[PDB]
Amino acid sequence: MYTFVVRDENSSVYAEVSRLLLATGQWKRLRKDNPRFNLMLGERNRLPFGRLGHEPGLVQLVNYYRGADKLCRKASLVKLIKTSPELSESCTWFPESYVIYPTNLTDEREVFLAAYNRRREGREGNVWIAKSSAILISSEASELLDFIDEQGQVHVIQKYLEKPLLLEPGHRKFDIRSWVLVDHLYNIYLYREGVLRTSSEPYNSANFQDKTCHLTNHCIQKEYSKNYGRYEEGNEMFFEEFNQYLMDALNTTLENSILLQIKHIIRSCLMCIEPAISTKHLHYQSFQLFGFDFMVDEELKVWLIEVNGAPACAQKLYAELCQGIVDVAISSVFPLAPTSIFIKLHHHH
Amino acid sequence: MRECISIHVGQAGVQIGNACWELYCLEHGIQPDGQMPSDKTIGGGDDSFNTFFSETGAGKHVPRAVFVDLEPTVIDEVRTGTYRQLFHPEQLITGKEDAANNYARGHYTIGKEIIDLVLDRIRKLADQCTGLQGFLVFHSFGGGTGSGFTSLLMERLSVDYGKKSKLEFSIYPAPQVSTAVVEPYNSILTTHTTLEHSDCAFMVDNEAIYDICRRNLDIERPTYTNLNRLISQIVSSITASLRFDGALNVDLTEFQTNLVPYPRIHFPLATYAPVISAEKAYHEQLSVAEITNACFEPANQMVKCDPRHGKYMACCLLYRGDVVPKDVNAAIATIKTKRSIQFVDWCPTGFKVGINYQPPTVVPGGDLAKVQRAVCMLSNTTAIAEAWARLDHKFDLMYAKRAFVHWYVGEGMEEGEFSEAREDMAALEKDYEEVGV
Amino acid sequence: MEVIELNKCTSGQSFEVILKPPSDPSLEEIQKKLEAAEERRKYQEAELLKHLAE
Amino acid sequence: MREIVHIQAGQCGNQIGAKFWEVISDEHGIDPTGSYHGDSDLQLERINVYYNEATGNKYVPRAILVDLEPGTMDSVRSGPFGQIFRPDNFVFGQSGAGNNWAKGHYTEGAELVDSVLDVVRKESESCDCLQGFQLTHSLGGGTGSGMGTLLISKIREEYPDRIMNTFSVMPSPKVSDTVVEPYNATLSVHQLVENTDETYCIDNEALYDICFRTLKLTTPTYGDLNHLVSATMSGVTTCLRFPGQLNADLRKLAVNMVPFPRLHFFMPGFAPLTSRQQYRALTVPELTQQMFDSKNMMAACDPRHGRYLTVAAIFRGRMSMKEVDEQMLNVQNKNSSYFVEWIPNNVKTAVCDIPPRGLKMSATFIGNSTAIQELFKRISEQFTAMFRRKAFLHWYTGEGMDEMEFTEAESNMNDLVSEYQQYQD
Ligand SMILES: Nc1nc2c(ncn2[C@@H]2O[C@H](COP(=O)(O)OP(=O)(O)OP(=O)(O)O)[C@@H](O)[C@H]2O)c(=O)[nH]1
Ligand SMILES: Nc1ncnc2c1ncn2[C@@H]1O[C@H](COP(=O)(O)OP(=O)(O)CP(=O)(O)O)[C@@H](O)[C@H]1O
Ligand SMILES: Nc1nc2c(ncn2[C@@H]2O[C@H](COP(=O)(O)OP(=O)(O)O)[C@@H](O)[C@H]2O)c(=O)[nH]1
Ligand SMILES: Cc1cc(F)cc(S(N)(=O)=O)c1
Ligand SMILES: [Ca+2]
Ligand SMILES: [Ca+2]
Ligand SMILES: [Ca+2]
Ligand SMILES: [Mg+2]
Ligand SMILES: [Mg+2]
Ligand SMILES: [Mg+2]
């Protein structure tokens, strides 16, 4: 009879996992402060990793990799890409980015301007975007820097993909979401089901003031978009439809044109930090679900946007995926008395 | 030659002292009767082993040790054991009833009545020192004596020996090898009142010693003798510089200078390798780089924690056996490119290396196998603060209900000393977090 | 990767390597505290005997 | 040399104490004449805790027998080991206590208490370092209850910093002598709440139900009920009588078991309890499962109705101490909802290599559980059912007591229940 505690009531994902765990009749939920637990569904911020693996007779498991914030923070991801030789500063799947601290606080202000002045002089598309974890699109560097100073937190400026792949009919932008699960053995499993959070507004390149046809977030389309739900239910096109489209329109498959680049990026990011966050020889074990967001341009090239360390799931995929977490992540360390729904990305540890 | 007086307090301190001086004797070739054939100067001399051993005209080499316990059962074994002849009776001090695992009892109730007696015996060893360096204090956190009387002793030593250094070897509490429930209280009480009196302290987590014995030595249920023989191997590696010829850590002053740039943050993390089981007929002898790389594995640390998520302030590598400088630096390169070793920017990203050619000495019939080379890493990581967090949390759970507080108040301690002590740990944790994040 | 301050003797050697450069209470006060708690024990025992005398 | 002074008072106290010294005497190799004939030095390592050493290597128990009537103690002297007890340590009278707390605490007992303390003082003056005292007695009678608590109150006056331990038999209407037992128990319980550090609650109903249902004894006898108490007493004291990595004196036990001064009433337990299928080997899991089961507990309380503040288990015999740890942590990790979470690691386990006579291995359970409040609830209800009508008060008022003193004892224990109730939530 295994025991677990819940410390993040807002997690839609693990609320289902906890619901499923109890459905097995072999897992028992305890109070969120009872230290005798085999599994912790921990809080997001300030999860006390240092208190794990010190209870005699209990093999404890947590659903977060300590140090994975280096990859799920806008500014941290930039530093990690530029400084890490595995990814190098010339990594070809990540938009040119720079760390820009507001002037009321190292910083790459001048480094960005040099690259900006080079694009402004060479007649090249010089449209950037600023944002932070706590958005403004502009072609004038003056408007991007003045916006950051008006805030009090760190920001990041990166190149804006001006030639994004537009779905038809509609002529609309979009992004792709892939859920990735790493277990205690640091196996990288990719969920066979992705989602395209599409923009219900026709992409427009001569006006970055209105951010409804540029930002493909499920909330902005359902709040600031007028054609929400026209082409697909909930501005979400799953792999089946999107793959059929790539075949009728572009005469190719989602595997060859996009998925190979996605699987290559996932491996590169996770393998890079394996020495820093692995729990191979640690007194407790970790596993964590990740959410990668990619962009696809008109050349069918994939670009990495950001990595989410506490993502939600598409409504139609909560059951399948949640159950999958319980199979390869939890019960793999706490067995119970297919055709995997994942794609194992073999790698060298 | 400057001398070092070692003080063993409580059951843990005395038993650990029993395993260390046993080892000091096998290393320096001192027999149970106190004789040392290799020592050619009879009844004197300022050699390196004289920092820990005095000499009688009859050729006996007497440790510079003081054993204190509020109950006589544990020290009584020493008085009739293998090494009953090394010590003279003045060195062993025993009361008649212990502190009942009660910090207040060992500190106030019983401590007041015997403190002046201990200081007197200590003054006798000091009177045999031409240039006393300082004291090595061995004690437990959970013990009522280890925690209660030690903190009182430290306060007094700072008064009677101002300009002298004081290092601690502290035993961190672990449930698997303890029957006491109130050890978090005692731990946080003694760390609070001992902090400003200790220049450098090496915490050993019994949880770590236990698993190293079960994992490496295949001991299903280790005994204190098993735990202690291992603990003294690390202690020997830490004090080897003071007892043998060398240039690194030659006196106790060099331990704060080399490992503690900030005063309150004086708790280095110890990492030792290799620990091999003697039952193995023969084992592949590990290389310099292999044993070095192990120094950054959590599985050989004296306190289970993740140095990858801290920041180093210093780092000493102590080598014993067949090792040359060329080999050390080679492995160092290979590890920085593979490992996460983030220093604080106001500290040099460097390592101080010590090499002693005599390989580790093993107790005949002990649990550890003979090895050609071994290393002990002393690193000042913010990651050890994890141990304070675990302990402080256990303190919070109980104190929120005032459980067991009456036993302490009943010995004359004020309840306010609890919150005054806990708030000091809260300040200790903040310092680490400020230096690391 | 620099080696500095190499000392060599018959029983070993030591040296330093730099990878990267950077960027009390008196005896009177102790006697008081020890006696203060002893006074709180005497008072507590006094109230127990007072309790038992009643 | 951490000596303990044992005291047994009244009928129940002396008969139980009698069997207690009979059991441990066999375990330490002491015959009925005080001579040692054991085969292991472990039997004598801590032998002076409970025994004095007389001339000719004779071992004399450090026990003081007390009663207001000669009846019961005459049996002990004629009993098996009666000769082993010191002749002068027998202190008794002729008036008796008539199962009356007032007589034992104020009138009859007060005339004899000064002489008992004179013997206690004699045994203490010969103690190198006296740990404390332990008393055996019932609470529903007159001597063990009324005078026993009088002795404790006076011992605490003369030894305020020594530990006071008691083995207290609680009355039950199912195994009852007189209808005033709730009165006597309520009056003594208040004494124990104030002047003892640890009280092993022994409920005669639990003892009865164990003999009848578990032990399959058709018609139990006080002798049967005492065999259990004997085995239990030998279990809880194994830590004090034999060597081991546990050490443990009375003050250390009190400090780790009692988180609050007034909540110092323990539930003891013993395993195995086998009916005569008695030669079967009992596995470490079987020992543990039984040791925590309520049917093996002598407080007549269902622990699953409260929460454990602290728990101490003692295992006896050559066994896999690794396997002991495994099973103990299994019980905590499969029932953690019953252990208060604000006391980390409040379940400790000791091992002893010497099992009880005739058992390959055994396990004794010592629990500080808030469920004990159900016991004091039973006593309080039976008390109030009579006191509300003042029934039988004349027995007590006739000895000098007043109705006021009853209402206070009544309130003193109800408060005790409320204290146990707030710590259960
Ligand atoms: N490593 C090691 N730990 C020990 C040893 N002896 C006791 N301990 C630990 O110390 C803690 C208890 O402290 P003790 O040293 O026994 O207490 P004390 O100093 O004798 O103080 P008292 O309460 O008066 O007995 C427990 O957590 C034990 O695990 C030992 O020999 N070696
Ligand atoms: N360099 C770039 N080029 C093109 N589009 C970009 C871009 N950076 C961001 N976007 C747009 O912004 C959206 C992603 O925003 P971002 O992820 O930075 O904010 P966010 O983290 O609050 C949303 P989420 O965490 O859910 O992915 C995508 O839909 C994408 O279309
Ligand atoms: N377990 C047990 N209980 C007893 C025994 N004798 C009496 N009692 C209980 O003790 C209570 C009466 O106390 P008793 O010892 O007879 O009074 P006293 O001799 O005047 O102190 C009743 O509740 C009885 O059930 C005995 O031999 N064993
Ligand atoms: C190696 C050794 C020697 C010794 F004399 C006593 C011990 S102990 N007290 O830890 O069991 C250990
Ligand atoms: Ca000499
Ligand atoms: Ca000082
Ligand atoms: Ca009379
Ligand atoms: Mg985000
Ligand atoms: Mg002790
Ligand atoms: Mg009777």
Q: Which residues contact B426 (CB under 8 A, 6 or more apart)?
A: B392
- What is d(CA D194, CA D196) in angstroms, rounded to the nearest whole number? 6
3-state secondary structure of D109: helix
First to last CA, chain A: 33
Q: Which residue has the tokens 């801590």?
A: D46
Compute, in angstroms, the gap from residue D226 CA to the centroid of ligand 10: 14
Residue D20 in contact with residue D76, Cβ under 8 Å?
A: no
- What is d(CA D6, CA D13) in angstroms, rounded to the nearest whole number? 11
3-state secondary structure of A97: strand
**D353 and D421, same domain (yes or no):** no
8 Å CB contact of C45 and D156: no
What token pair was written down for B391? 């302990």
**D390 and D364, same domain (yes or no):** no
**D268 and D207, same domain (yes or no):** no
B15 lines ligand 1 (CB under 6 A): yes
- List the subunits that have 3+ CB pairs under 8 angstroms with C: B, D
Q: What is the DSSP string of D295-308?
A: GGBTT---GGGS-E
Is B239 flagged in the annotation as binding?
A: no
Q: Which residues contact B323 (CB under 8 A, 6 or more apart)?
A: B288, B355, B357, B373, B375
B254 is catalytic: yes
8 Å CB contact of C23 and B159: no
The last residue of a domain, from among D371, D387, D407: D371
**D267 and D352, same domain (yes or no):** yes
Interface subset of C 16-45, CB within 8 angstroms of B: 16-27, 30, 34, 36-41, 44
The beta-carbon neighbor of B306 closest among A56, A275, A282 is: A282
- What is d(CA B8, CA B137) in angstroms, rounded to the nearest whole number? 6
Most A CBs within 10 A among D336, D339, D342, D347, hence the mutation to make, goes to: D336
What single letter denotes the amino acid at residue A288? Q
Q: What is the DSSP string of A163-218?
A: SB--BTTTTEEEEEEEEEEE-TT--EEEES--EEEEEEEE--SS--SS-TTT---H
Q: Which residue has the tokens 């006593």?
A: D379
- What is d(CA C5, CA D204) in angstroms, rounded to the nearest whole number? 80
The last residue of a domain, from among D238, D259, D280: D259
Q: Which of D160, B155, B410, B68 lies closest to C32 in space, CA to CA? A: B155
**D137 and D236, same domain (yes or no):** yes
- Other Cβ atoms less than 10 A from the Cβ of B437: the count is 9
8 Å CB contact of B413 and C37: yes
**D192 and D83, same domain (yes or no):** yes
Alpha-carbon torsion D157, D158, D164, D170, what sign? negative
Q: Which residue has the tokens 């206590």?
A: D97
For β-strands A172-182 and A288-296, DSSP reports them as antiparallel
The last residue of a domain, from among D203, D236, D259: D259
8 Å CB contact of B97 and D129: yes
- What is d(CA D253, CA D255) in angstroms, rounded to the nearest whole number? 5
B228 lines ligand 1 (CB under 6 A): yes
In which domain, by residue range, is D397 found? 372-425
**Which DSSP helix (H) or strand (E) runs through B10?**
helix B10-28
**Which DSSP helix (H) or strand (E) runs through B21?**
helix B10-28
Q: Which residues contact A292 (CB under 8 A, 6 or more apart)?
A: A177, A178, A179, A180, A262, A265, A266, A304, A307, A308
Residue D195 in contact with residue C52, Cβ under 8 Å?
A: no
Is B71 flagged in the annotation as binding?
A: yes
The CA–CA distances, whole Å, from B365 to B14, B231, B368 equal 21, 16, 9
Residue B326 in contact with residue C4, Cβ under 8 Å?
A: no
Burial class (CB in 10 A: 0-12, 13-18, 19+), A92: exposed
Q: Is B334 near chain A, with CB under 8 Å? A: no
Q: Which residue has the tokens 């792709």?
A: A176
**D365 and D386, same domain (yes or no):** no
**D252 and D279, same domain (yes or no):** no
Read off the CATH number of the domain in which A20 is found: 3.40.50.11480
Q: Which of A145, A147, A146, A204 lies closest to A172 in space, CA to CA? A: A204
Give, using CA atoms, the residue closest to atom 3 of ligand 4: B19
Catalytic residue among B168, B183, B254, B386: B254
Q: Is A59 near chain D, with CB under 8 Å? A: no
**D38 and D124, same domain (yes or no):** yes
Total of domains in chain D: 3
Question: Experimental method used, please?
Answer: X-ray
Q: Which residues contact D417 (CB under 8 A, 6 or more apart)?
A: D373, D376, D377, D380
- Pocket around ligand 4 at a 6 A CB cut-off: B 15, 18-19, 22, 81, 224-225, 228-229
- What is d(CA B59, CA B57) in angstroms, rounded to the nearest whole number? 5
Q: What is the DSSP string of A109-131?
A: HHHHHHHHHHHHHTT----EEEE
DSSP D186: H
Q: Which of B396, B383, B397 lies closest to B425 in space, CA to CA? A: B396
Compute, in angstroms, the gap from residue B98 CA to the centroid of ligand 9: 5
8 Å CB contact of A66 and B393: no
- What is d(CA D85, CA D88) in angstroms, rounded to the nearest whole number? 9
Query: Which chain D residues are within 8 Å of B226, Cβ to Cβ?
Result: none
Measured CA angle at A331 (ends A329, A336), to 5 deg:
170
**D265 and D379, same domain (yes or no):** no
In which domain, by residue range, is A29 found? 2-69
- Per-residue HEC secondary structure of C5-36 comes to EEEEECCEEEEEEEEECCCCCCHHHHHHHHHH
- What is d(CA B193, CA B424) in angstroms, rounded to the nearest whole number? 10
Is B145 flagged in the annotation as binding?
A: yes
Query: Which residues does residue D266 pair with via DSSP β-bridges, in sequence order?
Result: D200
**D174 and D92, same domain (yes or no):** yes
Percent helix, strand and coil across chain B, each to the nearest 5: 45, 20, 35
- What is d(CA B73, CA D422) in angstroms, rounded to the nearest whole number? 41
Ligand nearest to C-alpha D207 = 3
- What is d(CA B173, CA B143) in angstroms, rounded to the nearest whole number? 9
**D217 and D333, same domain (yes or no):** no
Q: Which residues contact A291 (CB under 8 A, 6 or more apart)?
A: A177, A178, A179, A180, A307, A308, A309, A311
Torsion angle of C-alpha atoms D358, D361, D362, D363, degrees rounded to 10: 160
Query: Which chain C residues are within 8 Å of B333, Cβ to Cβ?
Result: 1
Measured CA angle at D351 (ends D165, A52), to 5 deg:
100
What token pair was written down for C26? 């008196």
Most D CBs within 10 A among C45, C50, C51, hence the mutation to make, goes to: C51
Q: Which residue has the tokens 């790698």?
A: A347
